Amino acid sequence: GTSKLKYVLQDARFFLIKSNNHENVSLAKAKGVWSTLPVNEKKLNLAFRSARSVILIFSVRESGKFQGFARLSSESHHGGSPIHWVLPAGMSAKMLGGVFKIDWICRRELPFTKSAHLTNPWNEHKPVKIGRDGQEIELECGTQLCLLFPPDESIDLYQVIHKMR
Ligand SMILES: CC1=NC(=O)[C@H](C(=O)NCCNS(C)(=O)=O)C=C1
């Protein structure tokens, strides 16, 4: 069912995350981490203190799909074990901000064709698939987008609900 999912998403904030490739999303799914450029890191840290859940919705460039969504479990931190991201040409590891711990809520994909009826007011009401890395998605659009994903029966949201407290 979808009731615990709706509870997690209640009054959440949502951010679109772009990855240059699938390798980085695979690493994020395996290790429960993400790192973004400092401009976006600042927004995510602010949002983490402001809302019960901050949701990252991932899309690999040119894939025509979203690859899942996850909830921030911490603000960003530095000085951990190096994650071997396969970074875009022109982006060094030193250019990234810190590392956010994340809990995956859905590891299933959603094709852009299924979200064509959703627009993001914070990006000029363009289709939600359209947007820059780090773009905030307004509450109602973000909630409906997350609810379109196929259910991920491998995930138990009981563990995430207790972190919201
Ligand atoms: C860890 C990681 N973080 C990212 O943020 C990545 C990205 O592809 N971001 C959007 C492109 N940014 S850029 C400066 O235009 O090339 C990829 C890996």
PDB file of all heavy atoms in Angstrom, residues 24 34 40 49 52 72 99 107 118 152 165, unseen atoms left out:
ATOM      1  N   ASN A  24      26.802   6.641 -11.091  1.00  0.00           N
ATOM      2  CA  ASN A  24      26.688   7.408  -9.856  1.00  0.00           C
ATOM      3  C   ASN A  24      25.398   7.105  -9.106  1.00  0.00           C
ATOM      4  O   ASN A  24      25.392   7.098  -7.871  1.00  0.00           O
ATOM      5  CB  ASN A  24      26.853   8.897 -10.137  1.00  0.00           C
ATOM      6  CG  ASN A  24      28.256   9.232 -10.593  1.00  0.00           C
ATOM      7  OD1 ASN A  24      29.214   8.595 -10.170  1.00  0.00           O
ATOM      8  ND2 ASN A  24      28.382  10.225 -11.461  1.00  0.00           N
ATOM      9  N   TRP A  34      24.788  10.781  -1.322  1.00  0.00           N
ATOM     10  CA  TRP A  34      24.872  11.624  -2.504  1.00  0.00           C
ATOM     11  C   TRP A  34      25.758  12.814  -2.183  1.00  0.00           C
ATOM     12  O   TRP A  34      25.840  13.244  -1.032  1.00  0.00           O
ATOM     13  CB  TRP A  34      23.497  12.137  -2.959  1.00  0.00           C
ATOM     14  CG  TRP A  34      23.557  12.807  -4.297  1.00  0.00           C
ATOM     15  CD1 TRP A  34      23.328  14.132  -4.578  1.00  0.00           C
ATOM     16  CD2 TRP A  34      23.908  12.192  -5.536  1.00  0.00           C
ATOM     17  NE1 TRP A  34      23.499  14.363  -5.920  1.00  0.00           N
ATOM     18  CE2 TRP A  34      23.847  13.185  -6.531  1.00  0.00           C
ATOM     19  CE3 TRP A  34      24.253  10.882  -5.906  1.00  0.00           C
ATOM     20  CZ2 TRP A  34      24.128  12.916  -7.861  1.00  0.00           C
ATOM     21  CZ3 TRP A  34      24.522  10.617  -7.225  1.00  0.00           C
ATOM     22  CH2 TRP A  34      24.459  11.628  -8.192  1.00  0.00           C
ATOM     23  N   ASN A  40      24.088  23.707  -4.549  1.00  0.00           N
ATOM     24  CA  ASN A  40      22.943  22.869  -4.213  1.00  0.00           C
ATOM     25  C   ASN A  40      23.043  22.336  -2.796  1.00  0.00           C
ATOM     26  O   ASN A  40      22.021  22.203  -2.114  1.00  0.00           O
ATOM     27  CB  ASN A  40      22.843  21.702  -5.198  1.00  0.00           C
ATOM     28  CG  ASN A  40      22.544  22.161  -6.603  1.00  0.00           C
ATOM     29  OD1 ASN A  40      21.911  23.195  -6.805  1.00  0.00           O
ATOM     30  ND2 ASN A  40      22.999  21.398  -7.587  1.00  0.00           N
ATOM     31  N   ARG A  49      16.851  21.312   7.642  1.00  0.00           N
ATOM     32  CA  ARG A  49      16.418  21.834   8.935  1.00  0.00           C
ATOM     33  C   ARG A  49      14.991  22.360   8.908  1.00  0.00           C
ATOM     34  O   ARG A  49      14.403  22.582   9.972  1.00  0.00           O
ATOM     35  CB  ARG A  49      17.346  22.963   9.381  1.00  0.00           C
ATOM     36  CG  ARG A  49      18.811  22.611   9.326  1.00  0.00           C
ATOM     37  CD  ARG A  49      19.658  23.867   9.273  1.00  0.00           C
ATOM     38  NE  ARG A  49      21.028  23.576   8.870  1.00  0.00           N
ATOM     39  CZ  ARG A  49      21.808  24.434   8.223  1.00  0.00           C
ATOM     40  NH1 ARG A  49      21.349  25.636   7.904  1.00  0.00           N
ATOM     41  NH2 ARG A  49      23.045  24.090   7.893  1.00  0.00           N
ATOM     42  N   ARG A  52      10.162  18.093   7.595  1.00  0.00           N
ATOM     43  CA  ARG A  52      10.245  16.767   8.192  1.00  0.00           C
ATOM     44  C   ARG A  52      10.954  15.776   7.278  1.00  0.00           C
ATOM     45  O   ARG A  52      11.609  14.850   7.762  1.00  0.00           O
ATOM     46  CB  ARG A  52       8.847  16.264   8.549  1.00  0.00           C
ATOM     47  N   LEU A  72      16.771  12.628   2.581  1.00  0.00           N
ATOM     48  CA  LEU A  72      17.957  13.009   3.341  1.00  0.00           C
ATOM     49  C   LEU A  72      17.831  12.529   4.781  1.00  0.00           C
ATOM     50  O   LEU A  72      16.828  12.792   5.450  1.00  0.00           O
ATOM     51  CB  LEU A  72      18.102  14.523   3.376  1.00  0.00           C
ATOM     52  CG  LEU A  72      18.393  15.264   2.075  1.00  0.00           C
ATOM     53  CD1 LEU A  72      18.793  16.703   2.397  1.00  0.00           C
ATOM     54  CD2 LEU A  72      19.485  14.592   1.274  1.00  0.00           C
ATOM     55  N   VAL A  99      29.063  15.205   1.741  1.00  0.00           N
ATOM     56  CA  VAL A  99      28.305  13.987   1.472  1.00  0.00           C
ATOM     57  C   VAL A  99      27.058  13.987   2.342  1.00  0.00           C
ATOM     58  O   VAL A  99      27.139  14.199   3.559  1.00  0.00           O
ATOM     59  CB  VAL A  99      29.152  12.726   1.716  1.00  0.00           C
ATOM     60  CG1 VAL A  99      28.313  11.475   1.489  1.00  0.00           C
ATOM     61  CG2 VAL A  99      30.368  12.723   0.799  1.00  0.00           C
ATOM     62  N   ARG A 107      13.570   2.518  -5.318  1.00  0.00           N
ATOM     63  CA  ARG A 107      14.667   2.283  -6.245  1.00  0.00           C
ATOM     64  C   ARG A 107      14.181   1.931  -7.644  1.00  0.00           C
ATOM     65  O   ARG A 107      14.997   1.594  -8.509  1.00  0.00           O
ATOM     66  CB  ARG A 107      15.604   1.194  -5.707  1.00  0.00           C
ATOM     67  CG  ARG A 107      16.423   1.648  -4.495  1.00  0.00           C
ATOM     68  CD  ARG A 107      17.587   0.672  -4.247  1.00  0.00           C
ATOM     69  NE  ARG A 107      18.454   1.015  -3.119  1.00  0.00           N
ATOM     70  CZ  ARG A 107      18.127   0.813  -1.847  1.00  0.00           C
ATOM     71  NH1 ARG A 107      16.945   0.294  -1.552  1.00  0.00           N
ATOM     72  NH2 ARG A 107      18.965   1.142  -0.873  1.00  0.00           N
ATOM     73  N   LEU A 118       2.393  16.531 -15.101  1.00  0.00           N
ATOM     74  CA  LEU A 118       2.818  17.241 -13.905  1.00  0.00           C
ATOM     75  C   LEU A 118       3.777  18.357 -14.282  1.00  0.00           C
ATOM     76  O   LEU A 118       4.754  18.131 -15.001  1.00  0.00           O
ATOM     77  CB  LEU A 118       3.509  16.295 -12.926  1.00  0.00           C
ATOM     78  CG  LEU A 118       2.653  15.154 -12.344  1.00  0.00           C
ATOM     79  CD1 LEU A 118       3.468  14.281 -11.392  1.00  0.00           C
ATOM     80  CD2 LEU A 118       1.415  15.698 -11.651  1.00  0.00           C
ATOM     81  N   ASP A 152       7.907   0.039  -4.437  1.00  0.00           N
ATOM     82  CA  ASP A 152       9.147  -0.713  -4.214  1.00  0.00           C
ATOM     83  C   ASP A 152       8.923  -1.590  -2.988  1.00  0.00           C
ATOM     84  O   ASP A 152       9.131  -1.171  -1.848  1.00  0.00           O
ATOM     85  CB  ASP A 152      10.347   0.214  -4.030  1.00  0.00           C
ATOM     86  CG  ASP A 152      11.673  -0.538  -3.981  1.00  0.00           C
ATOM     87  OD1 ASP A 152      11.664  -1.770  -3.727  1.00  0.00           O
ATOM     88  OD2 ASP A 152      12.744   0.076  -4.165  1.00  0.00           O
ATOM     89  N   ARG A 165      10.850  11.876  13.482  1.00  0.00           N
ATOM     90  CA  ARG A 165      10.581  12.366  14.838  1.00  0.00           C
ATOM     91  C   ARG A 165      11.539  13.466  15.266  1.00  0.00           C
ATOM     92  O   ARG A 165      11.233  14.241  16.170  1.00  0.00           O
ATOM     93  CB  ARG A 165      10.640  11.216  15.854  1.00  0.00           C
TER      94      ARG A 165
END
